[PDB]
Structure formats: structure tokens, C-alpha cells
Design a protein around this motif. Structure first.
Motif, PDB file in Angstrom:
ATOM      1  N   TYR A   4      -8.732 -49.118   9.836  1.00  0.00           N
ATOM      2  CA  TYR A   4      -7.750 -48.950  10.974  1.00  0.00           C
ATOM      3  C   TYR A   4      -7.110 -47.662  10.946  1.00  0.00           C
ATOM      4  N   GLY A   5      -7.776 -46.586  10.197  1.00  0.00           N
ATOM      5  CA  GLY A   5      -6.996 -45.120   9.931  1.00  0.00           C
ATOM      6  C   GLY A   5      -7.293 -44.077  11.021  1.00  0.00           C
ATOM      7  N   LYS A   6      -6.548 -42.975  10.457  1.00  0.00           N
ATOM      8  CA  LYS A   6      -6.857 -41.775  11.282  1.00  0.00           C
ATOM      9  C   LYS A   6      -8.248 -41.232  11.227  1.00  0.00           C
ATOM     10  N   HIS A   7      -8.987 -41.509   9.655  1.00  0.00           N
ATOM     11  CA  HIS A   7     -10.082 -41.031   9.283  1.00  0.00           C
ATOM     12  C   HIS A   7     -11.067 -42.189   9.647  1.00  0.00           C
ATOM     13  N   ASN A   8     -10.858 -43.535   9.714  1.00  0.00           N
ATOM     14  CA  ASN A   8     -11.832 -44.410   9.819  1.00  0.00           C
ATOM     15  C   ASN A   8     -11.623 -45.631  10.823  1.00  0.00           C
ATOM     16  N   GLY A   9     -10.428 -45.385  11.783  1.00  0.00           N
ATOM     17  CA  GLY A   9     -10.218 -46.200  12.555  1.00  0.00           C
ATOM     18  C   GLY A   9     -10.769 -46.496  14.239  1.00  0.00           C
ATOM     19  N   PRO A  10     -10.336 -47.093  14.816  1.00  0.00           N
ATOM     20  CA  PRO A  10     -11.439 -47.359  15.905  1.00  0.00           C
ATOM     21  C   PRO A  10     -11.750 -46.149  16.663  1.00  0.00           C
ATOM     22  N   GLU A  11     -11.144 -44.999  16.734  1.00  0.00           N
ATOM     23  CA  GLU A  11     -11.697 -43.825  17.466  1.00  0.00           C
ATOM     24  C   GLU A  11     -13.173 -43.233  16.675  1.00  0.00           C
ATOM     25  N   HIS A  12     -13.142 -43.870  15.531  1.00  0.00           N
ATOM     26  CA  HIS A  12     -14.341 -43.291  14.499  1.00  0.00           C
ATOM     27  C   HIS A  12     -15.530 -44.364  14.576  1.00  0.00           C
ATOM     28  N   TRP A  13     -15.310 -45.579  15.215  1.00  0.00           N
ATOM     29  CA  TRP A  13     -16.158 -46.651  15.020  1.00  0.00           C
ATOM     30  C   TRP A  13     -17.367 -46.369  15.378  1.00  0.00           C
ATOM     31  N   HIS A  14     -17.469 -45.845  16.863  1.00  0.00           N
ATOM     32  CA  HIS A  14     -18.645 -45.438  17.433  1.00  0.00           C
ATOM     33  C   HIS A  14     -19.893 -44.766  16.772  1.00  0.00           C
ATOM     34  N   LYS A  15     -19.516 -44.042  15.612  1.00  0.00           N
ATOM     35  CA  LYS A  15     -20.553 -43.331  14.689  1.00  0.00           C
ATOM     36  C   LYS A  15     -21.577 -44.288  13.973  1.00  0.00           C
ATOM     37  N   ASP A  16     -20.843 -45.254  13.488  1.00  0.00           N
ATOM     38  CA  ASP A  16     -21.674 -46.345  12.851  1.00  0.00           C
ATOM     39  C   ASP A  16     -22.152 -47.352  13.801  1.00  0.00           C
ATOM     40  N   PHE A  17     -21.317 -47.690  14.801  1.00  0.00           N
ATOM     41  CA  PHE A  17     -21.690 -48.572  15.662  1.00  0.00           C
ATOM     42  C   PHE A  17     -21.638 -48.255  17.174  1.00  0.00           C
ATOM     43  N   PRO A  18     -22.705 -47.587  17.581  1.00  0.00           N
ATOM     44  CA  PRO A  18     -22.720 -46.842  18.793  1.00  0.00           C
ATOM     45  C   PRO A  18     -22.433 -47.714  20.015  1.00  0.00           C
ATOM     46  N   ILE A  19     -22.348 -49.121  20.050  1.00  0.00           N
ATOM     47  CA  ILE A  19     -22.269 -49.996  21.351  1.00  0.00           C
ATOM     48  C   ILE A  19     -20.587 -49.984  21.264  1.00  0.00           C
ATOM     49  N   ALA A  20     -19.755 -49.201  20.510  1.00  0.00           N
ATOM     50  CA  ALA A  20     -18.340 -49.132  20.626  1.00  0.00           C
ATOM     51  C   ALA A  20     -18.224 -48.670  21.899  1.00  0.00           C
ATOM     52  N   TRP A 188      -6.927 -66.225  31.467  1.00  0.00           N
ATOM     53  CA  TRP A 188      -7.927 -65.503  31.891  1.00  0.00           C
ATOM     54  C   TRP A 188      -9.251 -65.193  31.159  1.00  0.00           C
ATOM     55  N   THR A 189     -10.281 -64.816  31.791  1.00  0.00           N
ATOM     56  CA  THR A 189     -11.597 -64.895  31.097  1.00  0.00           C
ATOM     57  C   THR A 189     -12.423 -63.595  31.437  1.00  0.00           C
ATOM     58  N   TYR A 190     -13.069 -63.133  30.502  1.00  0.00           N
ATOM     59  CA  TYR A 190     -14.038 -61.944  30.940  1.00  0.00           C
ATOM     60  C   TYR A 190     -15.042 -61.898  29.877  1.00  0.00           C
ATOM     61  N   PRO A 191     -16.171 -61.177  30.215  1.00  0.00           N
ATOM     62  CA  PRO A 191     -17.220 -61.074  29.265  1.00  0.00           C
ATOM     63  C   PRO A 191     -16.951 -59.677  28.387  1.00  0.00           C
ATOM     64  N   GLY A 192     -16.921 -59.863  27.016  1.00  0.00           N
ATOM     65  CA  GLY A 192     -16.799 -58.767  26.156  1.00  0.00           C
ATOM     66  C   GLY A 192     -17.251 -58.776  24.958  1.00  0.00           C
ATOM     67  N   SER A 193     -16.704 -58.478  23.756  1.00  0.00           N
ATOM     68  CA  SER A 193     -17.512 -58.181  22.666  1.00  0.00           C
ATOM     69  C   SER A 193     -16.337 -58.524  21.361  1.00  0.00           C
ATOM     70  N   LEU A 194     -16.910 -58.622  20.178  1.00  0.00           N
ATOM     71  CA  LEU A 194     -16.268 -58.581  19.050  1.00  0.00           C
ATOM     72  C   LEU A 194     -15.040 -57.379  19.238  1.00  0.00           C
ATOM     73  N   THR A 195     -13.955 -57.602  18.529  1.00  0.00           N
ATOM     74  CA  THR A 195     -12.807 -56.249  18.429  1.00  0.00           C
ATOM     75  C   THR A 195     -13.105 -55.430  17.382  1.00  0.00           C
ATOM     76  N   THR A 196     -14.060 -55.777  16.253  1.00  0.00           N
ATOM     77  CA  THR A 196     -14.189 -55.051  15.009  1.00  0.00           C
ATOM     78  C   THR A 196     -15.499 -55.067  15.040  1.00  0.00           C
ATOM     79  N   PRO A 197     -15.966 -53.943  14.249  1.00  0.00           N
ATOM     80  CA  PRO A 197     -17.466 -53.878  13.709  1.00  0.00           C
ATOM     81  C   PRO A 197     -18.047 -55.031  13.503  1.00  0.00           C
ATOM     82  N   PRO A 198     -19.214 -55.367  13.889  1.00  0.00           N
ATOM     83  CA  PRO A 198     -20.112 -54.841  14.649  1.00  0.00           C
ATOM     84  C   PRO A 198     -20.082 -54.571  16.205  1.00  0.00           C
ATOM     85  N   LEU A 199     -19.027 -55.262  16.776  1.00  0.00           N
ATOM     86  CA  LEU A 199     -18.635 -54.778  18.113  1.00  0.00           C
ATOM     87  C   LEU A 199     -19.636 -55.484  18.915  1.00  0.00           C
TER      88      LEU A 199
END
Ligand SMILES: NS(=O)(=O)c1c(F)c(F)c(S(=O)(=O)CCO)c(N[C@H]2CCc3ccccc32)c1F
Ligand SMILES: [Zn+2]
Length: 257
Positions: A4-20, A188-199
Motif C-alpha cells: 500500500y505505499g508510494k513505491h508499491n501501492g495501487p498505482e504500481h500494481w499494474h506492472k506485476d498485474f496488468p489486468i489492473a 447495489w450490484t455490478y461485475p468487478g474484480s478482486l481489489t488486491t492482486p491478483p485483481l
């Protein structure tokens, strides 16, 4: 690597988990005015009377309360679902401050925390297979606001000092998750994803409209947990939430109003 940080938080996840950056990521902002009332949505059926809590674990992201999911003992059905989904675990996401912590937002409002009760579709036999399917999981999300205590939460709160640090576990039997539910099951309901890796894009989200109330003291105990393992420098487990992601081509449906 992720966390969850600057260096490894949500905005970085896409590099290991592109479906982000995928087409049905979660969480989302729930625009209440634009959610579509669906008269044909059924009441949610929550059957938790035979639930068998087993253990509570600090996994280094959150804490998980685990259930025996080897029989249909705690199941979700109805609502927008077409099968039966077995409760495997619940966990929370929360903030450093009362003003943030939820993953979903409601008209951009953040709640202090959000409870996720995670269920897998029995037609896939096990959780690991279910996450590979577009209808594999049903996650019931419940917002927490700070105010009066939630007495059904206190047993979880009181065990947390035994699981302070990543990798700690404790027996946690006879916990009744019905004590965490608000009065109303409107959702409310909608189709989505896990909110943590692997997303993975495997979740039917069911977000209850009515928040529960927890006390400032209860949420303060969540914030004493640690993301580090024993014998490492203290990093308080706070702000373990993913921000709202693009809705893209999705409609959020409402069971009410
Ligand atoms: N926040 S969330 O509601 O969208 C959510 C997740 F984001 C997520 F990633 C997983 S996971 O893939 O199983 C993690 C396993 O490595 C789970 N599933 C559960 C069940 C198994 C498990 C183990 C650890 C943490 C969460 C989960 C999940 F409920
Ligand atoms: Zn979650």
C-alpha cells in the motif's frame, strides 16, 4: 512486492498485474443517482446460521476471519446471483483517519472502513478454481462509519493484539458473522474484480446501502495492527484500500428505490 505505499501501492500494481487496467476493475464510485433500479433483482439471501469460523490471520495486507467452506454452511444466494456461494473469509479495508478507508465510495463519499465477506460459487468446487471464472465470486461489501460501537465486532477487535504482525494466526471459533450485518439488505450490484492482486475479474459485487456503525475505539484497534512481521520496523496497517477505478462499460444496479 505489492502493498500500500508510494513505491508499491495501487498505482504500481499494474506492472506485476496488468489486468489492473482492465475492463471490470474494482472498487468503483457508486453514483447513487445513476444506479439503475432493477425491479427484477431478488432479495439477498444470507444464510449464516451454520457458519463455522476457524481462525483469524494477519496476512500482511489485512486480517482474514476464515471459515470452513468444505460444506454449505454459510452461503449467499439470491440477490443478483444464480448459484450458491460459500463464505470462505471476511476481511476489512480501513484508513489512517475516519475520513477514508473504504474501497467503494458512494457519491464520492468515503467511509472509515469496508467489510468484504468473500464467497465462491459452488459450481467451481473450490475458491482457486472459482477465481478463474467470470462468475466465480460474490463479495458482500458493507461500509463502516464511526459512531456507536458494533457489539458483534468486538470479538474480532479483542483478538487483534494476538495477531499484530504478518503471519500471525489465532483460533477463532464460534464467531458469528450475522453480528456484522446492518439492518437492511438493500444493495447495489455490478461485475468487478478482486481489489488486491491478483485483481482477477471474477467478482459479482453486492454492496449494501446501509453502513454499520463501529466505535472510534474499535477502528483504532484495527490501526494498531502491523503490515510488517515480528522483529521488523513497525509499519502500521492503515490505508489498505484501493481507490475507485474507472467504471468503463458497466452499469451499477440497485435493488431499491
Ligand atoms: N478485497 S477482495 O474482497 O476483493 C479479495 C481480493 F482482493 C483478493 F485478491 C483475494 S485472493 O486472490 O484470494 C488472495 C490470495 O492470494 C480474495 N479472496 C480471499 C479468499 C482467500 C484469501 C486469502 C487471503 C486474502 C484474501 C482472500 C479477496 F476476497
Ligand atoms: Zn477486500
Amino acid at each position: 512486492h505489492w502493498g500500500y505505499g508510494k513505491h508499491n501501492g495501487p498505482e504500481h500494481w499494474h506492472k506485476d498485474f496488468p489486468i489492473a487496467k482492465g475492463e471490470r476493475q474494482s472498487p468503483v464510485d457508486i453514483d447513487t443517482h445513476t444506479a439503475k433500479y432493477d425491479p427484477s433483482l431478488k432479495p439477498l439471501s444470507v444464510s449464516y446460521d451454520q457458519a463455522t469460523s476457524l481462525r483469524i490471520l494477519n496476512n500482511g495486507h489485512a486480517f482474514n476471519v476464515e471459515f470452513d467452506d468444505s460444506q454449505d454452511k454459510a452461503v449467499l444466494k439470491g440477490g443478483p446471483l444464480d448459484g450458491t456461494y460459500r463464505l470462505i473469509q471476511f476481511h476489512f479495508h480501513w484508513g489512517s483517519l475516519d475520513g477514508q478507508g473504504s474501497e467503494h465510495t458512494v457519491d464520492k463519499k468515503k467511509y472509515a472502513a469496508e467489510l468484504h465477506l468473500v464467497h465462491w460459487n459452488t459450481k467451481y468446487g473450490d475458491f482457486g478454481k472459482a477465481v478463474q471464472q467470470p462468475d466465480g465470486l460474490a463479495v458482500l461489501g458493507i461500509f463502516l462509519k464511526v459512531g456507536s460501537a458494533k457489539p458483534g465486532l468486538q470479538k474480532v477487535v479483542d483478538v487483534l493484539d494476538s495477531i499484530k504482525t504478518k503471519g500471525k494466526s489465532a483460533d477463532f471459533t464460534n464467531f458469528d458473522p450475522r453480528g456484522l450485518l446492518p439492518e437492511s439488505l438493500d444493495y447495489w450490484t455490478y461485475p468487478g474484480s478482486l481489489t488486491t492482486p491478483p485483481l482477477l475479474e471474477c467478482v459479482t459485487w453486492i454492496v449494501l446501502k446501509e453502513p454499520i456503525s463501529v466505535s472510534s475505539e474499535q477502528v483504532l484497534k484495527f490501526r494498531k495492527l502491523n503490515f510488517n512481521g515480528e522483529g521488523e520496523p513497525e509499519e502500521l496497517m492503515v490505508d489498505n484500500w484501493r481507490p475507485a477505478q474507472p467504471l468503463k462499460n458497466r452499469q451499477i444496479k440497485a435493488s431499491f428505490k
